[PDB]
C-alpha cells in the first residue's frame, strides 16, 4: 500500500517539472527523502542520471531497463536492492555509479557486477574489519573504470586500483586529514592524467607524482607545502600543462619557476606569496592566471607578457596600478581585481577590447575612467562596479551601454 500510494502521489508530470541537470549537463533527478522509487520514474526512456538520496531499503523493479539512456547513478545514504534484468541493462548501458554511504551495509553487493562501469565515486569510509577495500573487492571485475573519486577517510591505497589504472584516468582521494602510505605503489598510473590529492596534508611530493608521464592536472590543495621544490624533475613528463597550486602554505616561489613556459591555467591563488616575480612571466602559454588571496607587494609590468591570457584574478592582494603592458594584451576577459588597494587604472586600458567581467567593489579607484565603459564584451553583469563613479560618466555613454543591454 505504501509503494502504490507512492506511485499515486508522485505522478509523471510533476516529476518532469522537477527534472534538472547535473554538472556534466546530463538529465538528473534528485529524489530526496522518498519512501521508494515510483514507477513513474521508471516509465521514462531518456533518463541518464538516476539519483537516489535517502530512500530506506528500496527494491528496484526491472522497468529501469526502459530508461534507455541511463548512464549515471547516484546512491546517497540509500540501501539499494536490484534484480537481474536491471543488472543486464546496467551491464550493457550504465557507465557511471556514484555511491555515497555512512555504513558498509548501505553499499550493495550487486554494484560489482557491471560490465560497462566507467565512472565511480565512493563516498564514505571503505576501511573496516574484513572490509577494508573488501567491501568493494569486485572492482577487479570492472575493467573500464576511468574516474575514481574516494571520499573515504583513507589511510592506504589498494594495489587493485593500480591494476585498473591501465584504463583509469582520474583518482581524487578525499580523506578529511589522513595521510596515505604511497610507498611508490602508484607507478602503474600510465593512463592517469589528473592526480588530485585534496586535503592530503602531504607537505612533500613523492617521486611517483613526477614519474607519471601523463599527469596534466596537479593541485596539492591544503597539503601545507611550506616549500615546493620538485618541479625540476617534471620535465621528463611532457604533458603537464596546468599547475593549479592553490590553498596552500607556500611562503615563496623560487626564481627557477621562470624555467617553465608551457603552462596555461597557472592558478597560484590562496597562498602566502610575497610578490609575483618577472621570472613567472617567462611562461608564454599562460591563458589563465589566478593569484587570489596573496601578500603581493605590488603588480609589476611583466604581467603584460601574457597575450593569450583570458581570465586574471589577483584578488585580495596589495596591488596599486595596472601597467600599460597588461593592456597590450587584447584577450583579458575576467579581471577579478577587487578588494585591493588599486590607486587608478592608466588610460592605456583603452587598448583593452575583450574585457568581460570585472569586480571593483572595494579598491581605491577615485573615479571611473571612461575606458571601463569602452569595453564592449564587458556588460552590466560583468561590470560589477560602484554606481556613483558610473554616474560621473557622461549620460549618453551610459545610454549606449543601456541600449546594448536592452535594445
In whole angstroms, how large is the CA radius of gyration of the chain?
A: 26
Max Cα-Cα span within the chain: 75
Q: Are 327 and 351 in contact (CB under 8 A)?
A: yes
**233: nearest Cα among 206, 197, 253:** 206
Residues 294, 297: Cα–Cα separation, whole Å: 9
Residues 48, 43: Cα–Cα separation, whole Å: 13
C-alpha cell of residue 296: 603581493
- This entry's atomic model was obtained through cryo-EM
**Cα 314 versus chain centre, distance:** 20
Q: Are 239 and 193 in contact (CB under 8 A)?
A: yes
Residue 10: phi and psi, rounded to 5, are -90, 90
Residues 356, 353: Cα–Cα separation, whole Å: 9
3-state secondary structure the chain: CHHHHHHHHCCHHHHHHHCEECCCCCEEEEEECCCCCCHHHHCCCCCCEEEEECCCCEECCHHHHHCCCCCEEEEECCCEECCHHHHHHHHHCCCEEEEECCCCCCCCCHHHCCCCCCEEEEECCCCCCCCCCCCCHHHCCCCCCCEEEEECCCCCCCHHHHHHCCCCCEEEEECCCCCCCCCCCCCCCCCCCEEEEECCCCCCCCCCCCCCCCCCEEECCCCCCCCCCCCHHHHHCCCCCECCCCCCCCCCCCHHHHHCCCCCEEECCCCCCCCCCCHHHHCCCCCEEECCCCCCCCCCHHHHHCCCCCEEECCCCCCCECCHHHHHCCCCCEEECCCCCCCECCHHHHHCCCCCEEECCCCCCCCCCCHHHHCCCCCCCCEECCCHHHHCCCHHHHHHHHHHHHC
Residue 171: phi and psi, rounded to 5, are -135, 110
Cβ burial, residue 344 (10 Å; 0-12/13-18/19+): middle
Q: Are 162 and 188 in contact (CB under 8 A)?
A: yes
C-alpha distance from residue 72 to each of 28, 51, 366, 407 (Å) = 9, 8, 52, 42
**172: nearest Cα among 188, 157, 187:** 157
Residues 291, 406: Cα–Cα separation, whole Å: 35
Domain 252-407 has CATH 3.30.70.1230: no
Give the dihedral sign, CA 149/151/154/160: negative
Amino acid at each position: 500500500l505504501r509503494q502504490l500510494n507512492l506511485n499515486n502521489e508522485w505522478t509523471l508530470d510533476k516529476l518532469r517539472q522537477r527534472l534538472t541537470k547535473n554538472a556534466q549537463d546530463k538529465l538528473e533527478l534528485h529524489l530526496f527523502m522518498l519512501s521508494g522509487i515510483p514507477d513513474t520514474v521508471f516509465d521514462l526512456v531518456e533518463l541518464e542520471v538516476l539519483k537516489l538520496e535517502l530512500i530506506p531499503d528500496v527494491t528496484i523493479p526491472p522497468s529501469i531497463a526502459q530508461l534507455t539512456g541511463l548512464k549515471e547513478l547516484w546512491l546517497y545514504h540509500t540501501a539499494a536492492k536490484i534484480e537481474a534484468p536491471a543488472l543486464a541493462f546496467l551491464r550493457e548501458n550504465l557507465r557511471a555509479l556514484h555511491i555515497k554511504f555512512t555504513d558498509i551495509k548501505e553499499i550493495p553487493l550487486w554494484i560489482y557486477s557491471l560490465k560497462t562501469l566507467e565512472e565511480l565515486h565512493l563516498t564514505g569510509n571503505l576501511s573496516a574489519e574484513n572490509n577494508r577495500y573488501i567491501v568493494i573487492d569486485g572492482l577487479r571485475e570492472l575493467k573500464r573504470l576511468k574516474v575514481l573519486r574516494l571520499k573515504s577517510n583513507l589511510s592506504k591505497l589498494p594495489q587493485v586500483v593500480t591494476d585498473v589504472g591501465v584504463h583509469l584516468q582520474k583518482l581524487s582521494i578525499n580523506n578529511e586529514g589522513t595521510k596515505l602510505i604511497v610507498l611508490n605503489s602508484l607507478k602503474k598510473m600510465v593512463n592517469l592524467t589528473e592526480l588530485e590529492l585534496i586535503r592530503c596534508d602531504l607537505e612533500r611530493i613523492p617521486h611517483s607524482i613526477f614519474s607519471l608521464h601523463n599527469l596534466q592536472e596537479i593541485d596539492l590543495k591544503d597539503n601545507n607545502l611550506k616549500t615546493i621544490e620538485e618541479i625540476i624533475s617534471f620535465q621528463h613528463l611532457h604533458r603537464l600543462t596546468c599547475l593549479k597550486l592553490w590553498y596552500n602554505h607556500i611562503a615563496y616561489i623560487p626564481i627557477q619557476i621562470g624555467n617553465l613556459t608551457n603552462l596555461e591555467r597557472l592558478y597560484l591563488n590562496r597562498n602566502k606569496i610575497e610578490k609575483i616575480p618577472t621570472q613567472l612571466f617567462y611562461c608564454r602559454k599562460l591563458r589563465y592566471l589566478d593569484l587570489s588571496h596573496n601578500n603581493l607587494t605590488f603588480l609589476p609590468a611583466d604581467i603584460g607578457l601574457l597575450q593569450n591570457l583570458q581570465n586574471l584574478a589577483v584578488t585580495a592582494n596589495r596591488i596599486e596600478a595596472l601597467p600599460p603592458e597588461l593592456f597590450q594584451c587584447r584577450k583579458l576577459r575576467a579581471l577579478h581585481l577587487g578588494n585591493n588597494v588599486l590607486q587608478s587604472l592608466p588610460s592605456r586600458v583603452g587598448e583593452l577590447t575583450n574585457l568581460t567581467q570585472i569586480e571593483l567593489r572595494g579598491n581605491r579607484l577615485e573615479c571611473l575612467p571612461v575606458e571601463l565603459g569602452e569595453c564592449p564584451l564587458l556588460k552590466r553583469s560583468g561590470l560589477v562596479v560602484e554606481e556613483d563613479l558610473f554616474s560621473t560618466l557622461p549620460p549618453e555613454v551610459k545610454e549606449r551601454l543601456w541600449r546594448a543591454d536592452k535594445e
